[PDB]
Design a protein around this nucleic acid. Structure first.
Ligand SMILES: Nc1ncnc2c1ncn2[C@H]1CC[C@@H](COP(=O)(O)OP(=O)(O)OP(=O)(O)O)O1
Ligand code: SF4
Lengths: 261, 1140, 258, 259
DNA sequence: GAATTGGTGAGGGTTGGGAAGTGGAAGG
DNA sequence: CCTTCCACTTCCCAACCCTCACCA
């Protein structure tokens, strides 16, 4: 069997609400180490990864490693019935026909239970660079979400430039241009609010904003985000769930014709 | 009783005097003569007791112009069937019951198609009941029908009656069938004296028809300005008419200002049009003169173009004003159906033909259009507003017009209608009035009844109608249907043989063809031409040039070539499929009937199986909810049928009311209780056809098809002669042969409608032989054939359109095309084949051909011989110079059923579905389309092909943005107008909101119900800006107000623009210009610009925006940064699937 | 001639909108003892009853019994214009065919004054039959509202079962079946929080959830709501309107063929 | 050169939220006296006038008067990208086709810079008339907004009547008719809530509610509204915008003469 | 009583569901 | 006294229904 309990369903709710837009279905990797999810959007431009360590759950059992397919928008329906502070329980049995969910009010005044029907899927696995990235920045998550939303109004694609003096987002369209610039926080007010740049050497790249507007739905998970970038290779964004683990997106850049020359 | 008997005798006498005044003497004295049967009517006459009995008056004409009548009495009847062995009891009960009301009862064995095991030849007894008159049948059936009805509802001696049949066949349609009496034949007639019936019998010796006298007439009236005339206020100005090629005119000299004199009017050297003229001193004298001249010339056929609408009611009322009873003097009376009919002569209206048979668009049902198209000349122009002034100021112009309408009506009647109708009457039991008027489904039921009677088959009763039948899953069905013809539109843009086109080709296709070329040519020569391959010399010459060109293709598939535009369709597709499968409306069966059939033996080939797609729509309500709502209605109370009546209970509603109330209740319930009011479902079904069942229907289709094919062959021959005369350059011979070509084309077209009705009839509401499956199977096989032709052609080349019957395609310039063969028989000295047809035809032959067709060899031995048959053949059309298709504005939607095509001569060949053809679409759209299609012909390269059209279509945008600055003030009233029209009374559209209803209500305020009152109202309107943001239906301003008086116009415009202060009331201010600019933009986008971006060319029209989705996808194409896939930066580790 | 005045005018607004969408038009019944109303949804699945006692009004004059047809949309689009603390006057003539509505603002500087046309209706009318409700429940309103909202995404019918230990709501559908339990509580912080069942024998019945998605719109009238049930008998939903009246919805259960 | 600075950037945000519905493309003009805009609406039913004085800006340079064609629908979407507390700076050079908008978060940790293309427009305008109108009414704007919404629910148009005791509005339509009065306040408790009237002569006029129901879109811009009305003249609806500016709508009455 | 069939374009109005924006009251 | 969450209202698009007339 698989069985787990989580004291605060708002975490799993905010996760499903962040996956819902970008990927239609995925199959969970369940193991004694915890749960992981990886899947690729139907256009293969971008790739989702999630890690939820077993040590974050209130109780955990996984008698054998398991995988099972879920249509995420259907799960994003049922989990809308979990209350904002309800405690949540998941159970599955090795035929994987159905996933049981139970929600309990903080006072056990009420009990709610559901049977999510599971499905069969085929999916491919991608490799992981594990390189260092020539630039990394850490940032308030709401400020990055604001930058994405506003510049997305100006145009479909963003240019990133990072240099030791500061980082820049830029975009253009028939209206004209937008530029937004960030700098090192001079003295830390609190570690969540500071912006910090670390780098080897400067980097410049471009990306389709359409996927960033699906990434920023992570904002209610944490006040913090990390961006990692290196020349001519995918951009990586990371959000972290204090006890549970991490959610990361990988986005392939656009490259020039000059290699065609 | 006596009052009805005396009234019938009185009217029978009156009619006998009326026709005797026209010279149709009754054959009172014994003798023997011959004549041609021109008309008939049913009648009652006095027998040897002077009891009334029913009879038919047959009217004959002799070759010398003498004419006569015979009354033939015949006792109508219908059949009943009893429970087992009850026939003597039931017949004795019936014969005592209605003594003196019924004429005879008798037992007749007949075959009924539905009977179990009937193929053996088993048959069952029926009792015929026959009556001294139809009036006693009409009574007595009502004594029986409720009893047999309640017996059926469950299933004295009356209960032993189990069913009744044929009780509603029209009396004289019984008679003409039963005696094999038919119109337009020469007959002996013999009267022996009253000791015997009269004999009428056909003689086939005589070919030539008599030449009966025919009159056409037309009228014109004074009227009020800007409104219709009416029969009270207005008086006839002139009447023009022709008899047998001599023309006549009568004019009211009190209104018409000068004397009119005879003149001659000649549209064509064949239409000589001599017109005599009479001047009369008053309307009463004009009417009297016309009545007298009709009483003199005594025509037998009289004609008008749309007579029942205006001419007869108007002239009748103007006669009644002067007390002249037209019903007495002429004999025309308005029948119950609103139709002017007479006892002594036939009234034929050409518009009842043109509407039904001409295959003109509704755009051209105007006399001027139908004449201009068929006759090739323009009748002359007048406005109904000017007639009164022109007749005052310059009489001869209205005289010329009214004469021209006569000439057109007469010659149009003579050439097209006379041969066609009088030919068809030879095989349909009905009078010429009835055959012209009746609907196409009933004619075909008459032909089928003729054949069924000769087959001695008792008819089934009309199909009774279910309401709210359930699906087996319990949902109430809204609708049932079979999936119709397949349609797809694969390509877009432009094709011309003049310029290269890219191709790609599968190299195994040419190998597949080349491996069979010989068989394709052998089959195409032997079956299609019927010239055997032994009777031809050089069969081996062509085969090597084919094989060499196919190999030349196989070795180099990928190429750039000019296109060959060809169209490939299947002639008379649905008839031919019916024949080839031996489909018949009676022949579909289940296993349960086959379980009884003695031919249900191992090794039999009697049953064929074919597939069709059923479709239904049903409401989501459960069976339980519907049944509960029925139970809930048990308490309901309903208003009476009339205000004084008592309130009805729910069970005092009829079924036809209850079903509608239950539908409304269940729909309103579901609108709350479920999200979706209607669910649509499609299902594959297979149905079994018996191949041995009696062939009468299929043989009927065979005969009528062959009748059409005779004319089609004649048309082909005259086209050949035309082509020869064209190459010789003899304009007089071309002109003659073109006259022949047009005539025979029109005849075979007219036959097309009634031929195809054999397919649709099988579904028609109430039809006697009704079954839905045969209506499905012939659509689905017609989808299969054209799908596989799409598959085969798509490998060689590029399909461009696929409608129900036939592909349009482009083929590579090197393809085999035509070959010529030399025969050893002078009956067919040279033979020509084109390879595309043979290639497709063999494909059809291999799969579709029937190998189960059976025919009875020996009626006494029940032995059937198997055969094989195929009648389905493709035939080529083309080649053509240019082809163009439009494209839809919505991304990825394929805009079907619109294109333009051009002849090699550089002149329009076909042009389909556009506003230029539709009746009354916006005039600006018509002119734009017409010019741009003429522009696509021009230019030499695909850049110039579009660049030409841009320079034209810019003209109209320049006009709109110029506010038509220089356009004449009247010219806008044409250019900007829609001309839409309505099918129903405004009082019936009622509450619904749209521009047509809105402008009719707009007319009620200005001119009142005299316009509104009846169907066929037509509108002209513009949509206006001033009530800014008012939804579009509420800004409809009719041109009537621009035509009204200034003070009335200014009043109504103030009333509707909500504008007090405007000085310059002017359409140019009032037009909502940007509505018209966006209408033109969303037209031109569909024809030039989107067809350009789909053909990889720069934007042809700067001024018109591309749609947003297109502009985005085009811009993403066109920049230096490319989106890599993630799979190109990170390696693929493997593929996994997960399953439960 | 009829006139009545009510200081807590929002009572009229809320009670009107809890019908605004559900019933097209209805006839209001007026007597010296109060104002009354019955109507049915045009589906004829459900019955609406409203009563306001004249004792509860700030003023009440009624010289003879009267009945008057109105289409509720017309009243609703007017009562939108009343502020929630405005004092509401209804004035009508049995001599005439209009209803007058006057809103007095508690600032005593704003007043508003509307008239609307009645509708010409008459209707065939019966009282509800009294029944011994084998099951009844009192609930806080927000719990019932959330139950019906959440279950509406799972499916389009609810099966309810209850006994003195609790009430269970359950539903099934293609996306997955589920349940909610409200076990009978024994202690509460306040009576507004109490759930309380009373029973003669257990009951279970099936209801059309897309109608309870209308009956829930009475929630802003009252902190609490009452349900009553018996087999083969309509379910009653009842709300109490301050001290001055009550509003009730009666709905038949779905018939099962078996 | 032109440049200007504004710390109350939210006011400039909310100005364009008002203007965008009445005119989608217009020309601003800039002067040593301040920034101005005026136009007819696209339907040419009504007229709008707005100015913000240069004294209201936190710094301001205007070497020459200039006029700038701008698409309000686009510039509104640009200004949606500024935060409400952000300092707004505008600049353009006299030869430039481009307007620069720069937003500073007071932390200075973030700056956002936007370039927009101007467009080359020429505009028809006349110097606005004014008179000492026979009636003037001051009101809390939220009340007038609710009044116009309520009457727009019932029907097409309102008749507006002023008297010494109070200001009165009335309207009628298919479903019914409705009348409202606001009395003059007897003693002001606080100035934001006082309803007050000037009344030289009785006035009554009719107006189509569509345009009042647009003019109300400025409601977030100022807590109190003023109505200036007289016989035989357009109504003026006026909002005052802090110190530096004002927004005037001019609307002609609905005309009864057609009878 | 008398009455062929199904497919699709174009223009317009109605309905319902989701996203975005503002205000209140609830929480700390 | 300040900040966040929830409810309610407003705005926009997609989907479905009405008609007439040509295409098979
Ligand atoms: N009036 C009608 N009624 C019923 N079905 C009809 C029909 N008109 C067409 N059909 C259905 C059944 C036939 C099918 C195709 O009609 P084509 O015009 O392509 O005529 P085809 O039979 O091929 O003869 P061709 O004109 O080529 O000589 O459309
Ligand atoms: S198909 Fe064959 S088995 Fe069926 S009824 Fe006809 S002959 Fe008999």
């Amino acid at each position: 069997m698989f069985e787990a309990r989580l004291v605060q369903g708002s975490i799993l709710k905010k996760v499903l609400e962040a996956l819902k837009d970008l990927i239609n279905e995925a199959c969970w990797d369940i193991s004694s180490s915890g749960v992981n999810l990886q899947s690729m959007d139907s256009s293969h431009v971008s790739l989702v990864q999630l890690t939820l360590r077993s040590e974050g759950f209130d109780t955990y059992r996984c008698d054998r490693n398991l995988a099972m397919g879920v249509n995420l928008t259907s799960m994003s329906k049922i989990l809308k019935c979990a209350g904002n502070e309800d405690i949540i329980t998941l159970r599955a049995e090795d035929n994987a026909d159905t996933l049981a969910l139970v929600f309990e009010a903080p006072n056990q005044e009420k009990v709610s239970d559901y049977e999510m029907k599971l499905m069969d899927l085929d999916v491919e696995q991608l490799g992981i660079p594990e390189q260092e990235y020539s630039c990394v920045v850490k940032m308030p998550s709401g400020e990055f979400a604001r930058i994405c939303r506003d510049l997305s109004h100006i145009g479909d694609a963003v240019v990133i430039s990072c240099a030791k003096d500061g980082v820049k987002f830029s975009a253009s369209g028939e209206l004209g241009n937008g530029n937004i610039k960030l700098s090192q926080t001079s003295n830390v007010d609190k570690e969540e609010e500071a912006v910090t740049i670390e780098m080897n050497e400067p980097v410049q790249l471009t990306f389709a904003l359409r996927y960033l507007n699906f990434f920023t739905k992570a904002t209610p998970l944490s006040s913090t985000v990390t961006l990692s970038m290196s020349a001519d290779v995918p951009l990586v964004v990371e959000y972290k769930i204090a006890d549970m683990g991490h959610l990361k997106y990988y986005l392939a850049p656009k490259i020039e014709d000059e290699e065609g020359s | 009783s006596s009052v009805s008997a005396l009234k019938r005798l009185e009217r029978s006498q009156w009619t006998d005097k009326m026709d005797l005044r026209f010279g149709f003497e009754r054959l009172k004295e014994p003798g023997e003569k011959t004549g041609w049967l021109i008309n008939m009517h049913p009648t009652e006459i006095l027998d040897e007791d002077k009891r009334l009995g029913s009879a038919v008056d047959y009217y004959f004409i002799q070759d010398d112009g003498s004419r006569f009548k015979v009354a033939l009495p015949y006792k109508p009847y219908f059949y009943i069937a009893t429970r087992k062995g009850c026939e003597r009891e039931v017949s004795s009960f019936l014969s005592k019951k209605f003594q003196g009301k019924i004429a005879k009862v008798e037992t007749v064995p007949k075959e009924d198609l539905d009977l179990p095991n009937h193929l053996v030849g088993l048959k069952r007894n029926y009792i015929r009941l026959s009556f001294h008159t139809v009036e006693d049948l009409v009574k007595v059936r009502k004594e029986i029908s409720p009893a047999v009805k309640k017996n059926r509802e469950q299933d004295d001696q009356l209960d032993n009656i189990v069913d009744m049949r044929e009780y509603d066949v029209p009396y004289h349609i019984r008679l003409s069938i039963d005696l094999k009496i038919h119109v337009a034949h020469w007959y002996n007639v013999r009267y022996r004296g009253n000791a015997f019936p009269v004999e009428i019998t056909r003689r086939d010796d005589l070919v030539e028809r008599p030449d009966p006298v025919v009159l056409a007439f037309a009228i014109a009236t004074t009227k009020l300005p800007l409104k219709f005339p009416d029969a009270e206020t207005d008086q006839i100005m002139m009447i023009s008419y022709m008899i047998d090629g001599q023309g006549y005119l009568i004019t009211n000299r009190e209104i018409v200002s000068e004397d009119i004199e005879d003149f001659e009017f000649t549209p064509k050297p064949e239409y000589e049009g001599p017109f005599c003229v009479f001047n009369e001193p008053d309307e009463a004298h004009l009417i009297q003169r016309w009545f007298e001249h009709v009483q003199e010339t005594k025509p037998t056929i009289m004609v008008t173009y749309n007579g029942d609408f205006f001419d007869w009611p108007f002239v009748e009322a103007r006669a009644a004003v002067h007390g002249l009873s037209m019903q007495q003097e002429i004999g025309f009376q308005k029948d119950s159906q609103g139709e002017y009919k007479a006892p002594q002569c036939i009234h034929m209206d050409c518009l009842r033909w043109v509407k039904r048979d001409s295959y003109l668009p509704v755009g051209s049902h105007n006399l001027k259009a139908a004449a201009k198209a068929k006759l090739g000349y323009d009748p002359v122009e007048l406005d109904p507003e000017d007639m009164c002034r022109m007749a005052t100021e310059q009489p001869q112009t209205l005289a010329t017009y009214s004469v021209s309408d006569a000439v057109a009506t007469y010659y149009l009647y003579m050439k097209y209608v006379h041969p066609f109708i009088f030919a068809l009457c030879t095989i349909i039991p009905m009078e010429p009035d009835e055959v012209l008027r009746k609907g196409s489904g009933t004619l075909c039921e008459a032909l089928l009844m003729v054949q069924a009677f000769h087959a001695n088959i008792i008819f089934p009763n009309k199909q009774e109608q279910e309401f709210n039948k359930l699906t087996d899953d319990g949902h109430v069905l809204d609708s049932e249907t079979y999936v119709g013809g397949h349609v797809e539109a694969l390509e877009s843009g432009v094709f011309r043989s003049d310029i290269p086109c890219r191709f790609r080709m599968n190299p195994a296709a040419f190998d597949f063809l080349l491996q069979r070329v010989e068989k394709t040519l052998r089959h195409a020569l032997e079956e299609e031409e019927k010239v055997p391959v032994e009777q031809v010399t050089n069969f081996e010459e062509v085969c090597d040039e084919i094989k060499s060109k196919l190999a030349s293709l196989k070795d180099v598939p990928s190429r750039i070539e000019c296109p060959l535009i060809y169209h490939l369709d299947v002639g008379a597709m649905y008839p031919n499929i019916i024949l080839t499968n031996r489909l018949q409306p009676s022949a579909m069966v289940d296993e349960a009937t086959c379980a009884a059939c003695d031919f249900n033996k191992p090794g039999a080939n009697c049953q064929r199986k074919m597939a069709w797609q059923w479709r239904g729509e049903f409401m989501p309500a459960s069976r339980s909810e519907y049944h509960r709502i029925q139970h809930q209605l048990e308490s309901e109370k309903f208003p009476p049928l009339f205000p004084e009546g008592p309130a009805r209970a729910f069970h005092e509603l009829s079924r036809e009311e209850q079903a509608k109330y239950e539908k409304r209740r269940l729909a309103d319930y579901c609108r709350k209780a479920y999200k979706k009011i209607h669910i649509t479902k499609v299902e594959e079904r297979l149905t079994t056809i018996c191949q041995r069942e009696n062939s009468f229907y299929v043989d009927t289709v065979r005969a009528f098809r062959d009748r059409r094919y005779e004319f089609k062959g004649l048309h082909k021959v005259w086209k050949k002669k035309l082509s020869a005369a064209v190459e010789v350059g003899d304009a007089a011979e071309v002109k003659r042969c073109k006259n022949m070509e047009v005539l025979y084309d029109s005849l075979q077209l007219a036959h097309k409608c009634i031929l195809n009705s054999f397919y649709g009839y099988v579904m028609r509401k109430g039809a006697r032989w009704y079954s839905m499956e045969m209506a499905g199977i012939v659509c689905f096989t017609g989808a299969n054939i054209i799908t596989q032709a799409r598959e085969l052609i798509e490998q060689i080349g590029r399909p461009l359109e696929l409608d129900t019957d036939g592909i349009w395609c482009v083929l590579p310039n090197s393809f085999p095309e035509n070959f010529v063969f030399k025969t050893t028989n002078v009956k067919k000295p040279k033979v020509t084949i084109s390879y595309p047809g043979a290639m497709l035809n063999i494909m059809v032959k291999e799969g579709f051909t029937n190998d189960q067709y059976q025919e009875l060899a020996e009626p006494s031995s029940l032995t059937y011989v198997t055969r094989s048959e195929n009648s389905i053949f493709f035939e080529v059309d083309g080649p053509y110079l240019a082809m163009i298709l439009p494209a839809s504005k919505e991304e990825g939607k394929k805009l079907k059923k619109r294109y333009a095509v051009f002849n090699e001569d550089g002149s329009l060949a076909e042009l389909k579905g556009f506003e230029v053809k539709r009746r009354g679409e916006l005039q600006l759209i018509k002119i734009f389309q017409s010019s741009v299609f003429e522009a696509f012909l021009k230019g030499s390269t695909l850049e110039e092909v579009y660049g030409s059209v841009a320079k034209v279509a810019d003209y109209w945008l320049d006009v709109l943005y110029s506010k038509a600055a220089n356009m004449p003030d009247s010219e806008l009233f044409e250019l900007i107008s829609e001309n839409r029209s309505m099918s129903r009374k405004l009082e019936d559209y009622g509450e619904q909101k749209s521009t047509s209803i809105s402008t009719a209500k707009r007319l009620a305020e200005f001119l009142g119900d005299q316009m509104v009152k009846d169907a066929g109202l037509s509108c002209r309107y513009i949509i206006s800006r001033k009530p800014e943001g008012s939804p579009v239906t509420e800004r409809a301003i009719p041109l009537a107000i621009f035509q009204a008086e200034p003070t009335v116009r200014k009043h109504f415009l103030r009333k509707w623009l909500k504008s007090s202060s405007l000085q310059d009331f002017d359409i140019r201010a009032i037009l909502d210009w940007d509505y018209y600019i966006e209408r033109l933009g969303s037209a031109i986008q569909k024809i030039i610009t989107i067809p350009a971006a789909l053909q990889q060319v720069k934007n042809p029209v700067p001024r018109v925006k591309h749609p947003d989705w297109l502009h985005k996808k085009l811009l993403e194409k066109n920049d230096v940064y490319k989106q890599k896939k993630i799979s190109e930066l990170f390696t693929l580790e493997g593929r996994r699937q997960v399953t439960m």
